[PDB]
Amino acid sequence: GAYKYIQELWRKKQSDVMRFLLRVRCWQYRQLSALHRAPRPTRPDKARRLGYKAKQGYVIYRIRVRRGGRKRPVPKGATYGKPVHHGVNQLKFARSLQSVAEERAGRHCGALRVLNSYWVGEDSTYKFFEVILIDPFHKAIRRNPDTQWITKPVHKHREMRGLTSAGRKSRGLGKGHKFHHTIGGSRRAAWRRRNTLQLHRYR
Amino acid sequence: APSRNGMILKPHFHKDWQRRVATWFNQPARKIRRRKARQARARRIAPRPASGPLRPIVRCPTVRYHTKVRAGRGFSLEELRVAGIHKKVARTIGISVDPRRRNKSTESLQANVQRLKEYRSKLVLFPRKPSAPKKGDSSAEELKLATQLTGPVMPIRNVFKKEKARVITEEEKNFKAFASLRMARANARLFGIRAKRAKEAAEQDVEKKK
Amino acid sequence: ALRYPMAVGLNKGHKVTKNVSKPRHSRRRGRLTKHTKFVRDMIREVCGFAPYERRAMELLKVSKDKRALKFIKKRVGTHIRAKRKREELSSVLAAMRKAAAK
Amino acid sequence: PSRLRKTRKLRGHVSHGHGRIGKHRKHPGGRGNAGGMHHHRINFDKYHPGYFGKVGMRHYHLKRNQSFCPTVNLDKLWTLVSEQTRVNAAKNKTGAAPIIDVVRSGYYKVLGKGKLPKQPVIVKAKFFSRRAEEKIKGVGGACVLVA
RNA sequence: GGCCCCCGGCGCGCCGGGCCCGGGUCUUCCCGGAGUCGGGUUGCUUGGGAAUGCAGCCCAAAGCGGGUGGUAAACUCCAUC
RNA sequence: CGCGACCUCAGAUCAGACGUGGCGACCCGCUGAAUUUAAGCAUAUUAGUCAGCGGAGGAGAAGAAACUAACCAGGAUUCCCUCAGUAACGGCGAGUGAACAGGGAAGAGCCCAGCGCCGAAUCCCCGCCCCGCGGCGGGGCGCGGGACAUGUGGCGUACGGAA
Ligand SMILES: [Mg+2]
Ligand SMILES: [Mg+2]
Ligand SMILES: [Mg+2]
Ligand SMILES: [Mg+2]
Ligand SMILES: [Mg+2]
Ligand SMILES: [Mg+2]
Ligand SMILES: [Mg+2]
Ligand SMILES: [Mg+2]
Ligand SMILES: [Mg+2]
Ligand SMILES: [Mg+2]
Ligand SMILES: [Mg+2]
Ligand SMILES: [Mg+2]
Ligand SMILES: [Mg+2]
Ligand SMILES: [Mg+2]
Ligand SMILES: [Mg+2]
Ligand SMILES: [Mg+2]
Ligand SMILES: [Mg+2]
Ligand SMILES: [Mg+2]
Ligand SMILES: [Mg+2]
Ligand SMILES: [Mg+2]
């Protein structure tokens, strides 16, 4: 089936074909606003593996994000404090750019419920992304049982809480020895557990 | 400042710990709540064991625990396959099934098949309607018990086989255990190099020809 | 002369008979399928090769094959990936050489 | 019981048992184990010889159960079994010798402290001492390795 | 203990629809998520120590592959996902 | 020099929907000190703690192994007891500091993309009738619109699956 071809082609990103296209796409995207609703998914394939479905009430915003790290917002330098914390230039945000991308798509379209995102290119200055969104109150989603989990109000603002695939990754949770921080729910919760004087009745 | 003899001891009360002290005045109230909730769940699953489903027998890991045996999480697929219970059905008759369990040795497998067989013997499957089709048991074994089973269903008891008094043949007596262990240690230690020197010597014998 | 099972040394541990079960279906992942192979190489004649790959082919042609690997390791990352790539490149280069000779 | 404590008896007296030349100030030494090297050194190196300094090899992912090997002495080996095995024996007249599975009772190694009574045994165990072996043989018994 | 309201929850009947929904045995086919993994890096983080986890930037994959197997690397068997 | 497809884009007080603020004990994501300790202090510590911003729910988060182990092996997540003030980190000083096993509380497992087969077999909105209507649903009937082949629905997902 064509999707497997498309998939394998897109892995040849250093190839002559895909490099040509990526350059032309990235030029084109750069010549638009920072947030615009793509009429259809640039990457159909990827979108399907991430859970897009080509029916009504699935949406896709292409969102630009400025690239590079995070300089410490303090006037001049003047991070007054112990010279551990004197750093301002070479320091780096916890979440990814892709998460930031989703978060912004989420912010803008409050009714819409961020499902998942994928990449469409990168300049020196910008990255580009494509956030799949969903109306939780369009009948075609509501009545389809397999999606109607997103219409539940626990799934409000997934991206804001660190719950999309992208913003999950910063949280630092997976099974096995390479984690332990996040061995309750999350990073914060384990610390909480580990720094509770459990003070029993009888002692 | 320390004064004449004592453990140079490190307490961990430098963070704001009194902000996160966790009292246990719940616990009685808790213990009850669980207990009510427990009795409710029994009553809901009416003649079904309060326990839960039946669970496999399983040995612990590590040299330490090794000798003991617990209840496992669920019966493997091979164990269901050999017993002849369709895995999707086994859930519906109160048989725990995990499918992530390997099955290394045949001693642990046949035991766990035996478990399921025994379960299926002493199980009282009620028919779907009061009108009785196949599988569903007789109204005798139904009226005489729509009874719950208190406690864990067919409990595992880690058990020992009594060895009778032998006579000590002149061979047991001959054995030099401590030595044997020392030897067995050193051969694991030295296996690998010995093989490298032999590989060296073999190369020297072949090199002599050419 | 009396071979008690021991808890320590080479053929150690509790002596138990082994069943030889069907290996889990999970274990066969990454096995190259006839149809996937066809797709893979169907695309290597559309898309063609990357720049670093091409540069390595040119090294391999010259028979400067250590420098080829030194390059691929710095480029790809590990040794084992670099070595596996160098064999593919040498296979490609050979099938060109066979194709030319006709 | 505050009733019993010392502050009840100090009521009335000015200094509260802390003296009036020197007082009860907050932290005159430094907090805690401060000054281990300087200014508390003597206490450290006359009640904790060897506090300071590294020694020996690191071991990163220590897991204690690998090194699990609880020992038992010949001293009280017969304790593992019911008296009536040690009694039906020194009797019997077959020269039987009853088995003692030590690993069942929760000891892996059998070390050799103590006098073993002149009464044959078969000791099954994961590990033995040299002396524990020897004593066992001298009783007229047989050590037995188990996995 | 009683009576009266209301509401819940479960039991039986009728109708309206939907719904022709198994298992083993032998054969022939089918099979996996890329700017991701991985590497280098710098900064934070961790008990995690020749890098526990998260980041930016650069490189940038494979398919009997890939990941893990708490000391860096090469060769090699195993185990485990 | 028109008319007609589509593509990409606008504008509507267009028809019908949703989002905005609050609360914040608990919860998720970021951000992030300095008093303080070290008898001084800069790494360390205080602390991923206060303050700061964001977003929730009746709980949240987590969760059905790219896991543990190295055993005769265990088998999602969470919680307690233990592991353990231990392995480890550390001007190896001050100080800091987990995990597996073991015993319990509870217990539940699943679905896509893909690969394939099936006349798109699928969905939304209109309009007419019968029931039902204070959580807008059922059934029928319309050459009544649209979405959709740049892929909807049934079968199926590694515990193998199809024919
Ligand atoms: Mg500091
Ligand atoms: Mg990653
Ligand atoms: Mg229970
Ligand atoms: Mg005094
Ligand atoms: Mg005074
Ligand atoms: Mg004084
Ligand atoms: Mg730190
Ligand atoms: Mg090593
Ligand atoms: Mg709000
Ligand atoms: Mg100070
Ligand atoms: Mg001071
Ligand atoms: Mg000062
Ligand atoms: Mg800290
Ligand atoms: Mg706060
Ligand atoms: Mg939840
Ligand atoms: Mg997973
Ligand atoms: Mg666990
Ligand atoms: Mg202790
Ligand atoms: Mg800390
Ligand atoms: Mg499909």
Curated annotation (Swiss-Prot), chain A:
GO molecular function: RNA binding; structural constituent of ribosome
Predominant place of localization: cytoplasm
An example Gene Ontology CC term for this record: cytosolic large ribosomal subunit
Region (Disordered): 164-185
Phosphoserine: residues bearing it: S33, S96, S99
Stored SMART domains: Ribosomal_L15e
Cross-link named Glycyl lysine isopeptide (Lys-Gly) (interchain with G-Cter in SUMO2), sites: K82
Lipidation (N-myristoyl glycine): G1
Subcellular location: Cytoplasm
GO biological process: cytoplasmic translation
Comp. bias intervals (Basic residues): 168-181
UniProt keyword terms in alphabetical order: Cytoplasm, Isopeptide bond, Lipoprotein, Myristate, Phosphoprotein, Ribonucleoprotein, Ribosomal protein, Ubl conjugation
Pfam family, one: Ribosomal_L15e
PANTHER family for this protein: LARGE RIBOSOMAL SUBUNIT PROTEIN EL15, RIBOSOMAL PROTEIN L15
Subunit structure: Component of the large ribosomal subunit. Interacts with IFIT1 (via TPR repeats 1-4).
Family: Belongs to the eukaryotic ribosomal protein eL15 family.
Reported function: Component of the large ribosomal subunit. The ribosome is a large ribonucleoprotein complex responsible for the synthesis of proteins in the cell.
NCBIfam families linked to this entry: PRK04243.1 (NF003269)
Protein known as: Large ribosomal subunit protein eL15
Organism of origin: Oryctolagus cuniculus
UniProtKB/Swiss-Prot annotation, chain C:
PANTHER family hit by this protein: 60S RIBOSOMAL PROTEIN L36 (PTHR10114)
Pfam families reported in the protein's UniProt record: Ribosomal_L36e
Task performed by this protein: Component of the large ribosomal subunit. The ribosome is a large ribonucleoprotein complex responsible for the synthesis of proteins in the cell.
Broad class of where this protein is predominantly found: cytoplasm
BP-aspect Gene Ontology terms: translation
Protein name listed in UniProt: Large ribosomal subunit protein eL36
Family: Belongs to the eukaryotic ribosomal protein eL36 family.
GO MF annotation list: structural constituent of ribosome
Residue numbers bearing the N6-acetyllysine modification: K61
Residue ranges of the region described as Disordered: 8-30
Ribosomal protein found in the keyword field: yes
Swiss-Prot record, chain D:
Presence of keyword Transcription: no
Modification N6-acetyllysine occurs at: K46, K54, K109
Pfam family, one: Ribosomal_L27A
Principal location listed in the UniProt entry: cytoplasm
UniProt PTM: Hydroxylated on His-38 by MINA.
UniProt-annotated stretches for the region Disordered: 1-36
(3S)-3-hydroxyhistidine: residues bearing it: H38
Intracellular or extracellular location(s): Cytoplasm
Similarity field: Belongs to the universal ribosomal protein uL15 family.
Protein's job: Component of the large ribosomal subunit. The ribosome is a large ribonucleoprotein complex responsible for the synthesis of proteins in the cell.
Name of the protein this chain belongs to: Large ribosomal subunit protein uL15
Native species: Oryctolagus cuniculus (Rabbit)
Recorded name of the encoding gene: RPL27A
